[PDB]
Amino acid sequence: HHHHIIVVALYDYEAIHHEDLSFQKGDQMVVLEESGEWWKARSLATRKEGYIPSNYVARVDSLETEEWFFKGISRKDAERQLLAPGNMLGSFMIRDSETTKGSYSLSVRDYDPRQGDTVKHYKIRTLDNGGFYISPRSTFSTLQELVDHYKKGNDGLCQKLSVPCMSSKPQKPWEKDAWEIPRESLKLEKKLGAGQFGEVWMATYNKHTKVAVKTMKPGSMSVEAFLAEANVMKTLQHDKLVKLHAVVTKEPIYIITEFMAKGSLLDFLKSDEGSKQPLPKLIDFSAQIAEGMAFIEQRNYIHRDLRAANILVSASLVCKIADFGLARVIEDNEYTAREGAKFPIKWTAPEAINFGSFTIKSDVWSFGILLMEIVTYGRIPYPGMSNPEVIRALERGYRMPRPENCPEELYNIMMRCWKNRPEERPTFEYIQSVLDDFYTATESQYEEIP
Ligand SMILES: CN1CCN([C@H]2CC[C@@H](n3cc(-c4ccc(Oc5ccccc5)cc4)c4c(N)ncnc43)CC2)CC1
């Protein structure tokens, strides 16, 4: 009923809107209301009221207040964060277990010549009368005691704990209730590119926030159809999908999203920087997209144009799916027809080309082609073949051969994605599983330390 949760700032926040409350790390507050990413709160110190970023604060009695506790992180994202540049041997984090509810997991950066950079996971068990342990000989009253113990010595661990995994201030939340925004709120600063049905620009919103704006050409979309689809796209909240912040519901329609500093995955892989990414990183890029596409599958949605051109890359090298569902709202009329085909033949499933049958299974086919794009660093699919040759070849059972530097398991995934019958193709859930655990035939999941 009432709101009795007291929170403390995990970072400083300077108000940029109207009803937002500014605060500094340590400042404690009372949550008066939970309105999503924004929470109405009261300063325990200066009595001031106002909205605060929910991701910048934590319950005062929580482990979320600790530098080494990572709340709401998956085993995979912990591995990716720990293996990120700027972390050292023994870098570590404690997180909520994904296998045993109420219990915790210790993730540590390790290095072996034969294995390379690795992340080892330890199960922190809870004691019934209070306390925690990884090995029965070593029990602790608190998790801080456990950390300090393993920071003094490995005591069975792969490495002595060094420093907490590095973290950065999270993204500031988009303004409360600013979905359909005025066009004058946006200053278009640099055109990033121009396509068949519109352009993309880097811009500033209300002088305070950098964003990307997809500007759709007049005649490309109905305002009402677009807004209905956009209201669904807004619900597709997942870390591997580009964040849609707002829209201008007047022709020319604008779609405002977070800015992704490294552009398209296609351009990145063809870049001097991306060409140097090792195969394990390429498989991780693939798994990131598979996680996003598994979410879209669980939500009964369809991308309709999956390809490296439609994957965006952050400065932190995180891949995020873009243009999910957009092809459904690009109308087929006299205006768009001049721009040429909406779908790239070499990425499109045969049933979609021949009958317009677009489903999650046609996305699976496209994901297979995207996997080949990634392992080939952006090479055109079906090298040496025109679009007409590809369609007739696919009808005769032709499939792209395994490229160099392509693990056979990855190629096998591609082949399954390219089954002619959509029902015989794998689920994104399966694809995500195989890719997330590609190098984990180690089994055990955790470490069995005595
Ligand atoms: C040769 N190159 C030249 C550069 N081209 C680039 C043109 C714009 C780039 N680009 C595009 C985007 C982008 C922006 C909005 C968008 O709209 C939707 C998002 C989700 C669901 C539905 C619609 C989709 C994509 C982008 C970005 N956010 N942040 C940073 N860069 C971004 C992506 C590639 C690509 C080809």
Author numbering: 80 to 114, 116 to 255, 257 to 531
From the paper:
Hematopoietic cell kinase (Hck) is a member of the Src kinase family and is a promising drug target in myeloid leukemias. Extending from the active site is another dynamic element known as the activation loop, which bears a single autophosphorylation site (Tyr416) conserved across all of the family members.
Here, we report a new X-ray crystal structure of Hck bound to A-419259 in which the activation loop and αC-helix are fully resolved. The structure was determined at 1.8 Å resolution and revealed the autoinhibited state, with the SH3 and SH2 domains bound intramolecularly, while the kinase domain adopts the DFG-in/αC-helix-out conformation reported previously with A-419259. The kinase crystallized in the closed conformation with the SH3 domain interacting with the SH2-kinase linker and the SH2 domain bound to the C-terminal tail phosphotyrosine. While both inhibitors occupy nearly identical positions within the active site, A-419259 has a much more extended structure than PP1, with a cyclohexylmethylpiperazine group that contacts Asp348 and a methylphenoxybenzene moiety that extends further into the hydrophobic pocket. A-419259 induces an extended activation loop conformation with the tyrosine autophosphorylation site facing away from the active site and into the solvent. In the kinase domain, the complete αC-helix and activation loop are clearly visible with the autophosphorylation site (Tyr416) extending outward from a short α-helix. We propose that this preferred A-419259 conformation represents a unique intermediate between active and inactive conformations of Hck and possibly other Src-family kinases, while PP1 induces a more fully downregulated kinase domain structure.
